[PDB]
Amino acid sequence: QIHLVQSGTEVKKPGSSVTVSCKAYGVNTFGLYAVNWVRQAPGQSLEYIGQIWRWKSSASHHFRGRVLISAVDLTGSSPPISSLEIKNLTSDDTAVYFCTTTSTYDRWSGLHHDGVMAFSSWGQGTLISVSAASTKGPSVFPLAPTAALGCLVKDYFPEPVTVSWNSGALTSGVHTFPAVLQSSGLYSLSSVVTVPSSSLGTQTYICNVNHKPSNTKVDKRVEP
Amino acid sequence: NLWVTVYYGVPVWKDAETTLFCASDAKAYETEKHNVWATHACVPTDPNPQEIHLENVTEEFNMWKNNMVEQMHTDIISLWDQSLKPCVKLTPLCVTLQCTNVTNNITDDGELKNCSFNMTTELRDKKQKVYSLFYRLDVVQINSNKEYRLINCNTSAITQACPKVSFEPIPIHYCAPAGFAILKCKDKKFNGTGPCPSVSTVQCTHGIKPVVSTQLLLNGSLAEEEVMIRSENITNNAKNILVQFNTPVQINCTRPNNNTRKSIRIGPGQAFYATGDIIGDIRQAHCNVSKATWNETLGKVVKQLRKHFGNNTIIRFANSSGGDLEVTTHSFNCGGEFFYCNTSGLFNSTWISNNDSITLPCRIKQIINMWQRIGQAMYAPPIQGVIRCVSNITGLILTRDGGSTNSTTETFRPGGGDMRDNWRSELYKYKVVKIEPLGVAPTRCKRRV
Amino acid sequence: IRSENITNNAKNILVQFNTPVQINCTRPNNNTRKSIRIGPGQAFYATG
Amino acid sequence: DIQMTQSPSTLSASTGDTVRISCRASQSITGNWVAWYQQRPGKAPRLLIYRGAALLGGVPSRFRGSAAGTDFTLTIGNLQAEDFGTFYCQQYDTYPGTFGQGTKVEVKRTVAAPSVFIFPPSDEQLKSGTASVVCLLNNFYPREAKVQWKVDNALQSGNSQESVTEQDSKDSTYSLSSTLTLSKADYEKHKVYACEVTHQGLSSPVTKSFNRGE
Amino acid sequence: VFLGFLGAAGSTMGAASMTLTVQARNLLSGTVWGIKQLQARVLAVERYLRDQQLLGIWGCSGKLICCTNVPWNSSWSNRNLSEIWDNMTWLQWDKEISNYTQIIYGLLEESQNQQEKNEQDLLALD
Amino acid sequence: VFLGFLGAAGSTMGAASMTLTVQARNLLSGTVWGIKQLQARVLAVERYLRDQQLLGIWGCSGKLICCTNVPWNSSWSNRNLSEIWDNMTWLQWDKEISNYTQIIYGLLEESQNQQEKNEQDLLALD
């Protein structure tokens, strides 16, 4: 069976370049399969970047001259793989990048139309994050208060942060909102909990925020 | 405003498959001898094998899924039995055999036996006491002097291809009927898969000898420029890999023994052709190959592997692994007889980056089950005297090893044994399609009222 | 009730059900098959 | 470039239902070179239908496409749990291949009024130099909800950011976080700070606010 | 010119409409293992008479060219006259037509000869 | 409309002259016991080429409809125009005409194409 395995996640700064690998196991050759690279911006649609069919590289006019797409047939060791290289990165290129494998053998297949084709097999994806900021631990503040309270995890980079309450004791009614990317090019999110107000003075509530990139760990008490 | 318009006989074709038919020309048809090998009813070849080139046509070729092979695979087997059925059935030959190590003066550590056994005649009552000389591979012993019996007796009913019919491979041109055609991929460096740049159509193939052989290809087509490397998938070691020479290689195969053929009457109308005593010197079969062009062949080959594998690496040759004798050794018919040869010293080598000849031992086996089909065997009658056949080596079949050590060394040995690979040697450039002469395309035209 | 001619007793008469009827047929003996070699390629499967 | 306008952006359905997603193109695509994809969150998309109504090897028979002129429709009769997710339509009649805006396919649930809370900035934030006010909208169905920040009975825009949770298997509802951020100095330039929620489940817009110190 | 069998393939259709009588002429071309050469040419006369049958029951009844009262629908491969004949070959074009050929063909058989050949007896019965 | 193969059979001929392209299109349909499936499709092409043979050597040369210069003799089952097409079916009518069909057919082959096709070379010898 066909499995497309691409490279690991990379974080990089603007003005730099980057190449993502795409292991194509199961494909017999890129002479009977074409490789299409498609980008998916955060929480939006997908975008065609380029392809390589009949060993002919391609660009979107939008991405004309900014990108290079190469591929090589299988080594005796390894199956054939394609590589997507991007230059002069901007924060507007931050997205997930997809590998595509489509059989080109039959002219009538309907999957392809003179180079412009649909995408039959896909890979896991490579997250490329473009930002000028460096690693930084989060500043955690309390969202003090049936009533609700929470923790506000602000000014952190890069993702992700894990939020747990009372060292995992409080799990029901816990909403840890996803990260939003601030104007400062920094991440920030909040995690809230709904609990009965009769127990606000009885029990104590503490959220546990951990950030592995900065190796920082803080436990913030949400006093009413 | 566009309409629909029908056009008959448009250059629209689609890919399909059907039954093809042979062409043996007329010259090997005259070989006759009561159905020499294949050619009996075979259609003649075109005197001018018209080859028409098509332009602006990008066609994707696959030799490994090509259907013309499976046909050629089955016909040779059916045509095989079509000889054996009128021929002499040796099923009564399964008998207790009293045999002896053949007469020679010591210096051994045999394989030939003086075999006395009680047989039958054309007259059903009276019987026969006869002796014959057999190779060790056609019999097996059973447990005073040791007694022996044939190897096929507990497997498959044995027949004998009558001496009129020969085994000699006769060039065959496979042809296609109307509404179809055959396409020849002529581009010099072609790996057999993907699209084919040079596409030309013919109604018949070139001369193809259906050589029944293993581990080596003889008399076939030669490649062009670099020696071409063709494999369906090279990442799989299990899939066989085929090569094609630009330079043909000479080999002289001989059975040096001078045989006698004893024709004994099992009839009426039946009879059995046995082996008589060798006349004079006792020698053994063998074939010679030039070591010089051989060493240069491996050098020109190893430079071609370093395009697909590494720029600079190590390449080692070693002898085969295991299997039936039809695989582990080299099988083929030399004029009447089927030789099985030891291939070892050819492949004794280790290559990295930057006047005499060779010789190989050989064995002959008469009883042959080839294509393994049980319930029916065949016996090849012995040919009188010294046998000699000269062959020209146009192709190869190989397999690869396994993970071993990371990016260290790759080893190669003989392989194959499925005769479908034998037919892929000449069929790599061929494939079949079908015509769709009807088509509908818009224009301003419209019919009447 | 279907018959070519019913006045002739000799002509067979065929019937067709609206209701299918169940039957369970068994050979309760547990047989052994002895395959004996009459060959080459021939052989005979006997009853054990 | 062809522009694919998908519709609807979001639909709600329940197991066994027959559901329809339409996708209209800017030009007419006669060759029916349009495909359909399903993307569950995080995992890669799966090709479902090509060339209009061609079924990819292994895609259930429940998926079927119809192509007529400019309009295209993907149809899912007998909707299953495994089917829920987001769907996209793709054309490849002209270079480059282009996708649609997307259609979320959520589960059905009774309309739920949102629980609204307002959170003032922590005193630790004020001596840090920045001030963040959070408005929490919890367990709201459907997910269409607008929030605005009113200071001095005056609108404030461009400085508020939102974040929304993802479908809960137990309640099938959503929660949203609206974070309003501004400078320390601007924070004490007024007394009142208000979060107003407009939602279908509410008879009239519910406003929850706070004065400084209260 | 004589490009032989299929020789005008990768050229476009407006120039490739010249080998029609070439490929139309080479369509018909007129104990075991004698059976191998007998079954093969059976499909030649069947493939020929299928083309002659469709050419007859369509409103054409004559070889190598036809016109129709059937409209070219805008649901069918909408191209200009250069973009049909002069820009696209026969494989390239018939590739694009491969969906809607039957929707053409029912109008070829039924809206023409069930209609206009019905009109021949009605206009000739006087 | 299409009631299938032989769909308008027991209807009269004037309402039943519309399955002509149905039954004309459905006439051709494209070692031991392999012969059982072999002999089946043999008679169809001989029946079909017999129909194109006699259809060609009748004065018609077109499909599904024809008209003749041959008079209908009053001894040939004399019925009025409703009593032919709209009161009697194809089996009922062919029952009545089946005695006299060859008396028609010799006039179809011989008084038309040995006459009016022979007159064409006279009219066009200039």
Short mmCIF file of C-alpha atoms in Angstrom, two decimals, chain D residues 18-159:
data_model
loop_
_atom_site.label_atom_id
_atom_site.label_comp_id
_atom_site.label_asym_id
_atom_site.label_seq_id
_atom_site.Cartn_x
_atom_site.Cartn_y
_atom_site.Cartn_z
CA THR D 18 -29.57 12.87 3.77
CA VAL D 19 -27.37 15.95 3.50
CA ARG D 20 -26.40 18.15 0.55
CA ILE D 21 -23.36 20.38 0.05
CA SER D 22 -23.38 22.68 -2.98
CA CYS D 23 -20.34 24.20 -4.70
CA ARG D 24 -20.64 26.80 -7.48
CA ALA D 25 -17.83 27.84 -9.84
CA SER D 26 -17.00 31.18 -11.44
CA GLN D 27 -16.83 29.70 -14.94
CA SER D 28 -18.70 26.66 -16.22
CA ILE D 29 -16.71 23.42 -16.05
CA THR D 30 -18.01 21.14 -18.80
CA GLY D 31 -15.45 18.35 -18.41
CA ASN D 32 -16.65 17.89 -14.80
CA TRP D 33 -13.08 18.23 -13.49
CA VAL D 34 -14.14 18.73 -9.88
CA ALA D 35 -13.23 16.66 -6.81
CA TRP D 36 -14.54 16.26 -3.25
CA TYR D 37 -12.49 15.81 -0.06
CA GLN D 38 -13.20 15.15 3.63
CA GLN D 39 -10.89 16.53 6.33
CA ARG D 40 -11.29 15.56 9.95
CA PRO D 41 -9.38 18.03 12.15
CA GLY D 42 -5.63 17.41 12.33
CA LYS D 43 -5.56 14.39 10.00
CA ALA D 44 -4.86 14.63 6.28
CA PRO D 45 -7.74 14.86 3.78
CA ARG D 46 -9.09 11.81 1.98
CA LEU D 47 -10.03 11.90 -1.70
CA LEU D 48 -13.72 10.99 -1.97
CA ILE D 49 -15.04 11.78 -5.47
CA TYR D 50 -13.26 12.80 -8.68
CA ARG D 51 -14.47 13.95 -12.10
CA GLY D 52 -17.87 14.84 -10.66
CA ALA D 53 -19.33 11.45 -9.70
CA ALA D 54 -16.39 9.03 -9.90
CA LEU D 55 -16.01 7.01 -6.71
CA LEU D 56 -12.47 6.38 -5.50
CA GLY D 57 -11.60 2.75 -4.82
CA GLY D 58 -12.90 2.04 -1.32
CA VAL D 59 -15.09 5.11 -0.78
CA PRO D 60 -18.56 4.08 0.50
CA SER D 61 -21.52 4.03 -1.87
CA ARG D 62 -23.26 6.53 0.45
CA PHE D 63 -21.15 9.29 -1.16
CA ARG D 64 -22.35 10.44 -4.58
CA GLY D 65 -21.75 13.56 -6.63
CA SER D 66 -23.77 15.39 -9.27
CA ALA D 67 -22.37 17.96 -11.71
CA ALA D 68 -24.60 20.27 -13.77
CA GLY D 69 -23.15 23.29 -15.53
CA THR D 70 -21.57 25.55 -12.93
CA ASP D 71 -23.22 24.04 -9.85
CA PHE D 72 -21.92 20.88 -8.16
CA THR D 73 -23.47 18.91 -5.31
CA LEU D 74 -22.00 16.26 -3.02
CA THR D 75 -24.71 14.09 -1.46
CA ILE D 76 -24.43 12.00 1.72
CA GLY D 77 -27.47 9.87 2.36
CA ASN D 78 -27.50 7.91 5.64
CA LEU D 79 -24.99 10.20 7.41
CA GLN D 80 -22.73 8.33 9.83
CA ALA D 81 -20.65 9.38 12.81
CA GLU D 82 -17.38 8.66 10.97
CA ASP D 83 -18.58 11.06 8.25
CA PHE D 84 -18.68 14.23 10.35
CA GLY D 85 -16.01 16.82 9.60
CA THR D 86 -15.22 19.54 7.08
CA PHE D 87 -15.63 19.14 3.31
CA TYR D 88 -13.95 20.96 0.40
CA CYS D 89 -14.60 21.04 -3.36
CA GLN D 90 -11.73 21.27 -5.85
CA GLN D 91 -11.62 22.10 -9.55
CA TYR D 92 -8.84 21.15 -11.94
CA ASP D 93 -10.28 22.28 -15.27
CA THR D 94 -7.74 25.11 -15.47
CA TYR D 95 -4.31 25.64 -13.93
CA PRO D 96 -3.87 26.03 -11.09
CA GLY D 97 -6.12 23.62 -9.20
CA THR D 98 -8.21 25.58 -6.71
CA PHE D 99 -10.21 24.66 -3.61
CA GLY D 100 -13.35 25.98 -1.94
CA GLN D 101 -13.90 27.91 1.27
CA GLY D 102 -15.07 24.75 3.01
CA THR D 103 -18.18 23.34 4.67
CA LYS D 104 -18.24 22.34 8.32
CA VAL D 105 -20.54 19.40 9.04
CA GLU D 106 -21.52 19.45 12.72
CA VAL D 107 -23.89 17.35 14.80
CA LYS D 108 -27.38 18.53 15.73
CA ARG D 109 -28.44 19.76 19.17
CA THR D 110 -31.15 21.96 20.63
CA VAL D 111 -30.37 25.67 20.61
CA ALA D 112 -28.59 26.62 23.84
CA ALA D 113 -28.29 30.11 25.27
CA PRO D 114 -24.64 30.91 26.09
CA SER D 115 -23.42 31.29 29.66
CA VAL D 116 -21.71 34.69 29.66
CA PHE D 117 -18.96 35.76 32.06
CA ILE D 118 -16.63 38.75 32.07
CA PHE D 119 -13.12 38.64 33.56
CA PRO D 120 -11.26 41.87 34.45
CA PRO D 121 -7.47 42.13 34.16
CA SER D 122 -5.44 40.57 36.95
CA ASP D 123 -3.65 43.01 39.26
CA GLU D 124 -0.43 41.21 38.31
CA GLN D 125 -1.01 42.27 34.69
CA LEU D 126 -1.36 45.97 35.53
CA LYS D 127 2.18 46.23 36.90
CA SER D 128 3.45 44.25 33.89
CA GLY D 129 2.48 47.07 31.49
CA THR D 130 -0.41 45.44 29.60
CA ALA D 131 -4.08 44.83 30.41
CA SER D 132 -6.27 42.00 29.10
CA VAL D 133 -10.05 41.68 29.54
CA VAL D 134 -11.63 38.32 28.70
CA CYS D 135 -15.25 37.56 27.80
CA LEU D 136 -16.32 33.92 28.07
CA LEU D 137 -19.20 32.43 26.06
CA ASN D 138 -19.73 28.81 27.07
CA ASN D 139 -21.91 25.96 25.77
CA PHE D 140 -23.49 27.91 22.91
CA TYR D 141 -25.42 26.37 20.01
CA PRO D 142 -25.21 27.15 17.23
CA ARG D 143 -21.64 28.47 16.94
CA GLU D 144 -22.78 31.72 15.26
CA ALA D 145 -22.27 34.37 17.94
CA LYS D 146 -21.02 37.96 17.77
CA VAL D 147 -19.41 39.87 20.65
CA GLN D 148 -18.41 43.53 20.93
CA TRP D 149 -16.70 45.62 23.61
CA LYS D 150 -18.43 48.80 24.80
CA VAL D 151 -16.52 51.42 26.80
CA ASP D 152 -18.25 54.75 27.54
CA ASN D 153 -21.24 53.44 25.54
CA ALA D 154 -18.80 53.53 22.60
CA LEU D 155 -17.65 50.78 20.25
CA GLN D 156 -14.13 49.34 20.38
CA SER D 157 -12.80 47.32 17.45
CA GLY D 158 -9.53 46.08 15.99
CA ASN D 159 -8.15 45.17 19.43
#
